[PDB]
Design a protein around this ligand. Structure first.
Ligand SMILES: CC(C)(COP(=O)(O)OP(=O)(O)OC[C@H]1O[C@@H](n2cnc3c(N)ncnc32)[C@H](O)[C@@H]1OP(=O)(O)O)[C@@H](O)C(=O)NCCC(=O)NCCS
Ligand SMILES: CC(C)(COP(=O)(O)OP(=O)(O)OC[C@H]1O[C@@H](n2cnc3c(N)ncnc32)[C@H](O)[C@@H]1OP(=O)(O)O)[C@@H](O)C(=O)NCCC(=O)NCCS
Ligand SMILES: CC(C)(COP(=O)(O)OP(=O)(O)OC[C@H]1O[C@@H](n2cnc3c(N)ncnc32)[C@H](O)[C@@H]1OP(=O)(O)O)[C@@H](O)C(=O)NCCC(=O)NCCS
Ligand SMILES: Cc1cn([C@H]2C[C@H](O)[C@@H](COP(=O)(O)OP(=O)(O)O[C@H]3O[C@H](C)[C@@H](O)[C@H](N)[C@H]3O)O2)c(=O)[nH]c1=O
Ligand SMILES: Cc1cn([C@H]2C[C@H](O)[C@@H](COP(=O)(O)OP(=O)(O)O[C@H]3O[C@H](C)[C@@H](O)[C@H](N)[C@H]3O)O2)c(=O)[nH]c1=O
Ligand SMILES: Cc1cn([C@H]2C[C@H](O)[C@@H](COP(=O)(O)OP(=O)(O)O[C@H]3O[C@H](C)[C@@H](O)[C@H](N)[C@H]3O)O2)c(=O)[nH]c1=O
Ligand code: NA
Lengths: 145, 145, 145
C-alpha cells in the first residue's frame, strides 16, 4: 500500500506501493507517482505529471503540467519549476514547455528551473541556482555569487 | 459567486465574482481581491492588501501588509515579497514599506522583491531574480548568473 | 499558554508560553520551541530542532534536523535551510550537517543557507542571498546581482 496523510488532498489513484504523501499536499487526478516516493508537506502536483520510483520531493515543491521526474531523483525543498517562458495572466499557451529531470539527478534547495529544461542523469544542481539551460549528465551546476 | 476551497482559511468577505481561492490558503479579514483572480494553493494574503481583477497568484506566494497588485498581474510560484528593509524579531516599524505591482506586470517564479518597490505596467521579472530597485514599465529584468 | 492553530499539526509538547503556531504548520514531536515565538503559516519543523525565545519564523520556512535557532532571531519568508551537502534520493548520511543561527541574527526573505553554516549574532542576510560560508557576527551579507 501507500500512505496518504489525512491532511493531504490526493485525487490521483495512480500512486505506487510504499509512496508517502505528507500533510497539506495537493495531487490532481492524472498525476502518476511510482513506488517508494516521499512527497513531503506543502507540495503541489498537477495533472500532466509523471514521477518515477524512489523519488524524494522535499517540502514546498510544485510540479506543473509538462514536468517528468525519472527514478531516484532528489528534489530539494522549495525547488521551483516553470512551464511558461513569457507568462501573462489569463494568456494560456497552446502547449506548456516540458521539463524532464533524468534518473538519479539531484536539485538543490530553492533552485529555480526555467521552462523546457532537461537536467541529465545524476546531475547535481547547487542550492539557490537558476537553471536557464540544460545541465549535462553527471555535471555539478551552480549560480556564481 | 466566488469559489473558496473548504481547505482554505478565507476570513475576507471582500472577494470579487469568479475568483478561485485554493487549498491551504490563508486570507485575513481586510484583504481586497477583485474579480476572476486565481489564488493557487499554499498562499498567504495579509490585511493591508489590495489585489485587482484577473490576477493570477501561483502557489506558495505571501502578500504582506503594504502590498498592492493591480489588474491582469501574473505572480509566479514562490515569488517572495518583503515590507521591512532591516528586519529584527519583535522590532515593529511605524510604517511597513509599500510595494505596488502595476497593471499587466509579470513576476517570474521564485523571484524576490525588496521593500518599497514599484514594478511598472507590463514589466517581466525573470525567474529567480532579486529586485532591489524599481523596474520600469514594459522592461524585462533578470539577475545575471 | 501557547496558541496552536486548529489547522496546524503540532506533535511537540516542548512549546514555550506565548508562542503562536499558525495554519498548515507541521511540528514533529522532538522539536523544542521557546517563549513568545511566532511560527507563521506553511512552516515545517523537524525533530532534531531547537528554537529559542522571541524567534520570528515567517511563512513557508522548513527547519530540518540539525538546525538550531537562538533567541531573538528573525527568519524571513521562504528562507530555505539544508542539512545534506551532496543529496542523493534514499542515500542517508550517518550525520546531517548542523546549522546554527546565532542570537539576534536576521535572514532575509527567500535566502538559501547551505549545510553546516553558522550565522553570527546580529548578522543581516540580504533577501534572496545564497549563504555558502559562515557569516560573521553583525555582518550584512548579500549575493551580488
Ligand atoms: C553545489 C554543491 C554540491 C557544491 O559542492 P562542491 O562542488 O563541493 O563545491 P564547494 O563546496 O567546493 O564550493 C566551491 C565554490 O563554489 C561555491 N558554491 C558552492 N555551492 C554553491 C551554490 N549552491 N551556489 C553558489 N556558489 C556555490 C563555494 O562558495 C565555493 O566558492 P569559492 O571557490 O569561491 O570558495 C553544494 O554547495 C550544494 O549546493 N549542495 C546542495 C545542498 C542542498 O540543497 N541540499 C538539499 C537539501 S538538504
Ligand atoms: C526573463 C525571461 C523572460 C527571459 O526571456 P528572454 O528575454 O527571451 O531571454 P533569453 O531566453 O533570450 O536569455 C537571454 C540571456 O539571459 C539569460 N536568462 C534568461 N532568463 C534568465 C533568468 N530568469 N535569470 C537569469 N538569467 C536569465 C539566459 O541564460 C541568456 O544568457 P546568454 O545570453 O548568456 O545565453 C525568461 O528567461 C524568464 O525568466 N521567464 C519567466 C519564467 C517563469 O517564471 N514563468 C512563471 C511560472 S510558469
Ligand atoms: C541586505 C539589505 C539589508 C541591504 O541594506 P543596505 O546595506 O542598506 O543596502 P543598500 O540598500 O544600501 O544597497 C546597497 C547595494 O546592494 C544592493 N543590494 C541590497 N540588498 C541586496 C540584496 N538583498 N541582494 C542583492 N543586492 C542587494 C543594492 O542594489 C545596492 O546596489 P548598488 O550599490 O549597485 O546601488 C537589504 O537590501 C535587504 O535585503 N533586506 C532584507 C529584506 C527582507 O528580506 N525582509 C524580511 C521580510 S519583511
Ligand atoms: C513525519 C513527517 C515527515 N515528512 C517528510 C519531511 C521529512 O523531512 C521527511 C522524512 O523522511 P525521510 O525519508 O527520512 O527523509 P527524506 O528522504 O525526505 O530526506 C532526508 O534525507 C535526505 C537524503 C536528505 O538529503 C534530506 N535533507 C533529509 O530531509 O518526510 C513530512 O513532510 N511530514 C511528516 O509528518
Ligand atoms: C484544481 C486546482 C488548481 N489549483 C491552481 C494551481 C493550478 O496550476 C491552477 C490551474 O488553474 P489555471 O487557471 O488553469 O492556471 P493558472 O492561470 O493559474 O496558471 C497556468 O496558466 C498560466 C498562464 C501559466 O503561466 C502557468 N504556469 C499555469 O500554471 O489552479 C490549485 O491550487 N488547486 C487545485 O486543486
Ligand atoms: C493572523 C495570522 C498571522 N499569521 C502570521 C503571519 C503574519 O504576518 C503574522 C503577524 O504577526 P506579527 O507578530 O504581527 O508579525 P511578525 O512579527 O511575524 O512579522 C511582522 O513584523 C516583522 C518585524 C516584519 O519584519 C515582518 N515583515 C512582519 O510581517 O503572523 C499567520 O500565519 N496566520 C494568521 O492567521
Ligand atoms: Na523560494
Amino acid at each position: 500500500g501507500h500512505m496518504i496523510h489525512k491532511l493531504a488532498d490526493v485525487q490521483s489513484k495512480n500512486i505506487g506501493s510504499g509512496t508517502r504523501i505528507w500533510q497539506f499536499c495537493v495531487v490532481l487526478p492524472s498525476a502518476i507517482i511510482g513506488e517508494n516516493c516521499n512527497i513531503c508537506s506543502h507540495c503541489f502536483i498537477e495533472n500532466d505529471v509523471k514521477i518515477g520510483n524512489n523519488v524524494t520531493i522535499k517540502c514546498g515543491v510544485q510540479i506543473w503540467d509538462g514536468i517528468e521526474i525519472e527514478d531516484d531523483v532528489f528534489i530539494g525543498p522549495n525547488v521551483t519549476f516553470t512551464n511558461d517562458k513569457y507568462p501573462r495572466s489569463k494568456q494560456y499557451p497552446k502547449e506548456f514547455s516540458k521539463t524532464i529531470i533524468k534518473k538519479g539527478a539531484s536539485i538543490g534547495a530553492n533552485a529555480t528551473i526555467l521552462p523546457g529544461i532537461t537536467i541529465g542523469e545524476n546531475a547535481m544542481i547547487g542550492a539557490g541556482a537558476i537553471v536557464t539551460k540544460d545541465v549535462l549528465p553527471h555535471v555539478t551546476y551552480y549560480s556564481k555569487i
